[PDB]
Symmetry: C4
Subunit: 291 residues, 4 copies
Amino acid sequence: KPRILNSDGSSNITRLGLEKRGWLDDHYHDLLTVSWPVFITLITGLYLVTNALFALAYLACGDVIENARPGSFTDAFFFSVQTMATIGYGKLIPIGPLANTLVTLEALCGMLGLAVAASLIYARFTRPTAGVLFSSRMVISDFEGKPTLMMRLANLRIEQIIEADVHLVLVRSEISQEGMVFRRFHDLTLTRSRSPIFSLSWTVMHPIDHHSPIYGETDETLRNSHSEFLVLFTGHHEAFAQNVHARHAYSCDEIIWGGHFVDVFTTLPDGRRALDLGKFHEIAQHHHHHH
Amino acid sequence: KPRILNSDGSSNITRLGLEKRGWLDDHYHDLLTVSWPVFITLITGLYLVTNALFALAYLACGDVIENARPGSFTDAFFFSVQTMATIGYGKLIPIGPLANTLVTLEALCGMLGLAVAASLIYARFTRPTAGVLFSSRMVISDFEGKPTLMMRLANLRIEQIIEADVHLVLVRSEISQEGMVFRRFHDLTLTRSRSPIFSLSWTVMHPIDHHSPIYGETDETLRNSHSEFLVLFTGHHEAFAQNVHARHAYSCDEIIWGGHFVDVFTTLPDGRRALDLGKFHEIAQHHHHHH
Amino acid sequence: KPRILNSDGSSNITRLGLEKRGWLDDHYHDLLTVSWPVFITLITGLYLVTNALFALAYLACGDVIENARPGSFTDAFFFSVQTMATIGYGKLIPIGPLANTLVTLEALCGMLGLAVAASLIYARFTRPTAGVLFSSRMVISDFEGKPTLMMRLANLRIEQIIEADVHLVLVRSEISQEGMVFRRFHDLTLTRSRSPIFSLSWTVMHPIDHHSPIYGETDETLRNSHSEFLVLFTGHHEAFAQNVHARHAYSCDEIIWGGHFVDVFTTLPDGRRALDLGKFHEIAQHHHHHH
Amino acid sequence: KPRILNSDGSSNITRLGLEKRGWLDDHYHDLLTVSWPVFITLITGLYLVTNALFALAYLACGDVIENARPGSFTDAFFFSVQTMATIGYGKLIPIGPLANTLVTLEALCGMLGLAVAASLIYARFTRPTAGVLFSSRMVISDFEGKPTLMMRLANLRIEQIIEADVHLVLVRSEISQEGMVFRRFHDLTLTRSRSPIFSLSWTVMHPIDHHSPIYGETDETLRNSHSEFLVLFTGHHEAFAQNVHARHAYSCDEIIWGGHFVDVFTTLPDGRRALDLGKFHEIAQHHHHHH
Ligand SMILES: [K+]
Ligand SMILES: [K+]
Ligand SMILES: [K+]
Ligand SMILES: [K+]
Ligand SMILES: [K+]
């Protein structure tokens, strides 16, 4: 069967045809999703193709610019870069009314061009990534006398995330009395969804009790309903002093029945007590005697 | 009867005044509610008419501006545009004390002008709109063996909204023991008010059970209390990595009794599984045999 | 008796002696609490007394500045304003090493001076006031068969506040088994503390039931315990697209026993249905036949 | 035994790596954790060494810069500082194509340099610290006829913190039926975890009742499980009109059994009613008669 939700928690559902688009959305992804090196280019290019134009625009007025060359674009281009950046050496001042007036316009442009450039540079500086690692598998094993759906996540940074909240949601196809078959979401009660200070590792646990949406359920029954599990994480990072988000999705076949995450708090004294994320996806299992 | 609440959730009540108004409110709507093209004008005009004034202010000092023309506004205007944007080609330097002093003043003006012009450009850049679509009607039909008040909303963009919250509120006129008739608000319990990842479509449902404020009601009883329904949606948008929200209101005559929304996750394989918002306001109903 | 809490919800408690102070606190009240006109001054003054200094600093190097006058402060001052604002007409360029080097320093100054000026101008633009009016009195009258502590608040603006939360807290002196007398806070359950869309008026109500901290309490008993009531309001304003806060405090003698707020939704058709805040503090009472 | 949690709530666990690091994290601590005086250096240096380079880059083009000195770095350096800050006196204008081209580049650099320099100045300006003081010890004494775990915190500033939230968490080593020994976290219910207006002092209390994770425990049993207590405080600060938070941790040997904090609201009339934080860490204890 196909994955409804990818592993990164992204919907694999197709959307239908043209209809819609916004700007703070438009003027915001292509410009704030690409790596800085890319971003700088996207602005360096914009920066130059605006000058080059105002340069064309100048030369389009004649031999206006004072002390420049006749029709030389590599003389008007420079006048713009000196006019827009509000540098104005003076040695190349505008001439007449068309120029001067175009100036008041080019500089105003480089003004907002500074503002905009600044807004963006800040929107970006404020889209902190979570730095949260999710275990590659899930497991269902006994804990405190009950079968327990588990999974864990770790902080890949030395800065603390405070007020961390984890949501573990079951998503399967069900059918109602009205015989209607629908996709449904279930908020699995975790023995702890709020963690005051997320610093190192955290194992989220769902005790499968008579009150659980997956009570008396097996790998088979789960697959039948095309069961999937979504995990959303959020918290206030201390590093950026801002909010942070992270999600991941699991499939039925990513659940190791009988598994046990191996202890990551591997305290090896000879220097200090530590945490090892090298063992983070490690899962213990009991194998049964073949014949 | 009239609509207490408009379709977009805006109150249709009249307010009585001549009293009070603020500034971060004043200096914020007329300036941050209008489309960018409009916004640009509102600043392009403020830009020039301040220059134009400072030009008037210069000429008013006499034949001061060195290397300009006598009383020519079309020469002092350009000096301001050159002084404010802090360009200063030099060929038109100030003259004396009144000028220079006016300069240190004009330039400072264009300074904050940059600041202000920046704050704004940012405030705006951060008032994301939520592209949430609300269905034109509501429906009361059976779901899980119970009459259920339903309505739905869709994400008009490809970006995901994290931590979505919907509130469906009944607002009607009631009467207390003290014989007082008051407009009351009722928070209807939904079979689910928090959505982890609002990605495609969502049908909000209110099971009308013996605990419901509309239990045993009918279109007639609902109209009598002049019942209305308000819906508030909020969520963290991944596009702008910011918060977003939306509201909408419905009246009694917008509730199709017996209706069923038509499935939108119209999976037409031959390419992929999808979602169609063309069928979003589509409601199925049983028609009774005429005689 | 003295007011522990003023009417605006401010503590009237004295703090003891010197010890402590921060900067984002220092560099933040004196500069962001004063009215804009004041703010502009505080920056206009800073702006000038920095130039005037760099001017002194220049003249302190000798007859350096080119094309200026000997020892004339009203010639170096202007050089700074032309150097800091990064204008640089050129006609007065620096001279030697001390000057030029001082320049690289003055301009860098006017740089951060732009940044800082910008940060602040934005912090300010983002300290939205609530615009929430609290009724001057409180009342205790029957509602739905029970004695009910009430009070109301109104939105003094045409923009909606969404997700409004009101907290009504009783604060009195109590004594424990250990015979210890302490000041205590009580969260009074309101028949509704969360309001999805605060637009016009809202009457907060505390049903005094056997579960109430003021059950079987009288004006006298309340005064004895020096009872006070605090009300905190918060919500997401749509206007500034930011959070908003407002608080107020009431005394025992600001509670009208037997009172009834008068209806503010005074619907006078002949034009439309309205809201009148002129009647907001109006309270009805039944007077008893004197003899 | 060692402290799993430091006094300031920082984890004292070792992390194992050579793996991963980010940028809005990189370009954010070394740059936004250091005191302003330090911050100013970190930029004043970056400012000059970029200028100095562009100077080297110019001279590397030969005797280009018009009106300068042959191969003199102390002439091209000043040209950059004049080109970057977009000053451009003009007397030192670029020369040819390599220069001018380098200009449009340098100036653009000083542009973003302004942007970046601005974002940062703002990020910082918005990482408010909470001036919350935590008591050095905790105490378990009787309150309302029950052993109660207590601790307290004070506001070190005159600004009010709105919507204060405190979480007091027990963290100890426990063992499950499956014979697994795990470090568990316990959210102790406080007789009050949310404070409307955190203005002076606050004594957080945990009634040790039959429902408490430390019911029937003793200093010895607590030490055996290597019990620790973590406290997280958060709130909206009115000073910066922003959010703030603080954490602190206590170990078993920091719990005074039988202790009582001494009253801090030391009301000494002869001027006014106050609060003394000099007695904040003051704990009273009964001493048993020696023989
Ligand atoms: K300039
Ligand atoms: K010049
Ligand atoms: K400039
Ligand atoms: K210049
Ligand atoms: K010149």
